[PDB]
Each structure stands twice: as structure tokens, then as C-alpha cells.
């Protein structure tokens with residue numbers, strides 16, 4: 001099992017943002033550095049076969065000396081060169097994107113003083129999946145907000161030529177006031193035992209992957225939109241597992257490619273469900289954009 005970073009920066013031209021550089025190639029911005037001797041370890045929020053991320057309190061973080069709670073990504077001791085570097089490619093990728101309200105942002109790092117620790121935001125209500133599974137009183141709108149919020153952050157990663165490649169409710173946290181925030185929680189989850197990741201010789205959340213990625217290992221922002229739809233499903237199905245009952249295998253594959261789509265969820269308005277269908281279009285060029293999806297969920301100003 002190889003660590004491997006999910007998030008990636010690609011080269012897009014005609015897009016409304018040009019990629020002049022590939023961060024992971026060199027950058028190291030020492031302006032994210034923070035004194036590990038001012039970080040207090042809380043409990044372990046989660047962990048997997050490569051590392052863990054634990055709660056902690058940072059004294060004097062930022063230009064405003066705040067003393068807020070944080071989540072420290074970190075690797076295990078068993079770690080080796082490769083792993084150690086993958087972690088850094090994710091920091092740089094983080095330091096490049098910048099900070100958006102609907103993304104688990106970067107707050108600091110400790111590249112010097114020993115092991116490298118990535119200090120990210122800390123969201124108090126946990127991940128979106130588990131949240132829906134415990135609140136089955138959510139309002140039809142509560143759901144409609146997470147969709148636009150998630151859609152917003154994904155609009156952002158898109159406006160930087162950054163692909164996710166793993167968009168799923170399990171990768172959406174819920175911070176203060178229940179605001180969403182996409183991210184990658186690879187460290188904190190144990191992929192070796194999560195049946196949502198099928199083996200590839202790597203581990204890929206197939207039921208979420210676009211057909212173009214399952215068949216031709218092609219990852220575009222449009223691949224992301226498809227998975228995003230798979231996410232709207234999880235939201236309105238209040239946490240069901242994609243393709244309920246269906247097993248990921250040879251038959252499954254022929255189904256998705258042949259245009260099969262998941263039936264409408266019980267709580268999804270017809271329009272919203274119509275977003276899933278578009279996102280699931282078989283041809284990438286016909287799927288919407290996270291911005292159109294963003295604007296459309298907006299048009300629902302009907303309230």
C-alpha cells in the first residue's frame with residue numbers, strides 16, 4: 001500500500017485560471033512554520049495505515065494570537081522517505097491553493113524540530129456522512145446548504161486547476177454553525193479495511209469514481225463533478241451507501257458504463273435530483289461545472 005496524495009494540480013489553459021507552476025515540484029514556503037512547542041496534543045481524531053491526525057490546541061496561531069483547537073496531520077515512525085515526501089507534496093499543494101471557507105484549510109506546519117506536522121483546521125461536528133446517519137431534526141434546507149457549500153469549495157479547487165479525485169460525504173467535515181468543508185481525510189481513515197476502496201493491485205473509491213476514471217485512469221475536474229453527484233445522493237439518501245445492495249464487480253462496471261444511474265433518493269427534490277443526473281452524464285463535456293451547479297443551487301432562491 002502506497003500513501004499517494006489524492007489532490008493534484010493539473011495544467012489547464014482555456015480555463016479561467018492558468019497554471020504557471022506546479023507547487024509540488026519545488027516550493028517550501030517557510031511562512032507556515034509554527035513552534036511545535038506551542039501545540040498541545042489532544043486525543044487522536046483518527047488514524048490509518050500511514051499515520052494519524054490528532055486534536056490539539058495552538059497557542060498564538062496567525063497574526064491575531066488566537067488559541068484555537070486544531071487538527072494535526074502527522075505520520076507514524078514506521079514512515080520512510082517516500083511517505084515523508086508525499087506528506088510535503090500535500091502541504092505545498094495546500095500552501096498554493098490558498099484559503100477558502102468551504103475547504104479544510106492549512107494553518108501551519110512544523111518542518112523543523114523533528115517530525116513534520118501539518119496543522120489544519122478543526123471542525124467540531126465531524127464528517128457529513130456520520131452526521132446524516134445520526135440525524136435521520138434535519139430540514140430539507142439543511143441538506144440543500146451542504147450541497148451548495150460543498151459545491152462552492154469544489155468550485156474553488158476547480159478555480160486553481162486542482163482535482164480532488166475522492167469526493168464523498170466521508171471527506172466533508174462540518175465546522176461551526178454546521179458549515180461544510182471538503183478535504184481529504186486519507187490519513188485519518190484506515191483504507192486497508194474500508195470496503196468502499198477496492199483494490200487495484202491501490203485503493204480507489206470506485207462507486208464514486210467517474211466511468212472515465214475507472215476504465216481509462218483519467219482524472220479531470222469533470223471526473224470530480226460526477227463523484228460530486230454521488231455525494232448529493234448520499235446527502236439526500238441521508239447517508240445510504242451508493243448503489244445499495246449492488247456489489248462492486250464485473251457486473252457493476254458494465255452497469256455504470258451502460259448509463260445506469262441510482263434511483264432518486266427519498267428526500268431529493270426533483271430539480272436537485274436533476275443535478276445528479278447531469279453530474280452523472282456519460283460524457284465529461286456534458287456534465288456541468290461546479291460553478292454552474294453552484295449558481296443553480298442558488299437559483300433555488302425560491303425560499
Ligand SMILES: Cc1cc(-c2c(-c3ccccc3)c3cc(Cl)ccc3[nH]c2=O)on1
Pocket residue numbers: 045046047053071073104120121122123124125126127173184185186187188189
Ligand atoms: C470526529 C471528528 C473528526 C474531525 C476532523 C478530522 C477527521 C478525523 C478522522 C476522520 C475524519 C476526519 C480531520 C482530518 C484531517 Cl486529515 C484534517 C483535519 C481534520 N479536522 C477535524 O476536525 O473532527 N471531529
